[PDB]
Amino acid sequence: KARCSRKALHVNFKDMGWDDWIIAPLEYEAFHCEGLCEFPLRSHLEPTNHAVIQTLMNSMDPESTPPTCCVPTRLSPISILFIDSANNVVYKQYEDMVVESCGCR
Amino acid sequence: KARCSRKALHVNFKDMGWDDWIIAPLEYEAFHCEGLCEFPLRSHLEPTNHAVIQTLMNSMDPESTPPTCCVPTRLSPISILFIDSANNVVYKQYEDMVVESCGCR
């Protein structure tokens, strides 16, 4: 097991069944977070106070408390260009689609 | 294994070695999140778009992608009353000390 970090996650829309509508992008890099959250907690993981406390207690008695989790701390959107039912050409922005950074929470 | 949710986490400061200074609180309920993040994703877990996508892919091929994680989505602070080195009586607020809600991220 490794230290919490951002790994790759290639997303393919051609598998969504949106083929009669979507124009671009047809795939994108979404990324994902995976890894161990434990001392020492490197600054980039930006732990919260609660995270620091929970990691301490889990460090003292793993049975009592589980470790914190490596999750996306900041995400960005992506816009999708498609042709809707009415045949209009829409450019829609979707929030929280790309992982910008991982941290322990 | 159960569904992502807020469990209890009783924190005891008398174990911090802050005894010559801290007055109150000496213990508090910090809570913690624990549980499975998988379909169906109940509304209270407030998943992000990225979470919905990652859960889908993990649902289609668990080897490729790991599930999302049950973590604190909103936290509140607590204030601590202590007597510092100079013998001043300080009332300090600490951010992100109590888990208000858990979600899948």
Swiss-Prot record, chains A, B:
Subunit structure: Homodimer; disulfide-linked. Interacts with serine proteases, HTRA1 and HTRA3. Following LPS binding, may form a complex with CXCR4, HSP90AA1 and HSPA8. Interacts with high affinity with NOG; inhibits chondrogenesis. Interacts with high affinity with BMPR1B and lower affinity with BMPR1A; positively regulates chondrocyte differentiation and induces SMAD dependent signaling. Interacts with FBN1 (via N-terminal domain) and FBN2. Interacts with TGFBR3.
Role: Growth factor involved in bone and cartilage formation. During cartilage development regulates differentiation of chondrogenic tissue through two pathways. Firstly, positively regulates differentiation of chondrogenic tissue through its binding of high affinity with BMPR1B and of less affinity with BMPR1A, leading to induction of SMAD1-SMAD5-SMAD8 complex phosphorylation and then SMAD protein signaling transduction. Secondly, negatively regulates chondrogenic differentiation through its interaction with NOG. Required to prevent excessive muscle loss upon denervation.
Tissues and organs where the protein is expressed, per its UniProt entry: Predominantly expressed in long bones during embryonic development. Expressed in monocytes (at protein level).
Localisation per UniProt entry: Secreted; Cell membrane
Span of the entire protein shown here: 397 to 501 of 501
Reported impact of residue 49 to T: In SYNS2; resistant to NOG inhibition; no change in binding with MPR1A and BMPR1B; strong induction of chondrogenesis
Connected disease: Acromesomelic dysplasia 2A: A form of acromesomelic dysplasia, a skeletal disorder characterized by short stature, very short limbs and hand/foot malformations. The severity of limb abnormalities increases from proximal to distal with profoundly affected hands and feet showing brachydactyly and/or rudimentary fingers (knob-like fingers). AMD2A is an autosomal recessive form characterized by normal axial skeletons and missing or fused skeletal elements within the hands and feet.
Gene field: GDF5
Species the sequence originates in: Homo sapiens
Effect caused by changing residue 45 to P: In AMD2B, SYNS2 and BDA2; the mutant is almost inactive; loss of binding to BMPR1A and BMPR1B ectodomains; no induction of SMAD1-SMAD5-SMAD8 protein complex phosphorylation; impairs nuclear translocation of phosphotylated SMAD1-SMAD5-SMAD8 protein complex; no ability to induce SMAD protein signal transduction; binds to NOG
Lineage: Eukaryota, Metazoa, Chordata, Craniata, Vertebrata
Similarity remark: Belongs to the TGF-beta family.
Intrachain disulfide bonds: 4-70, 33-102, 37-104
Listed name of the protein: Growth/differentiation factor 5
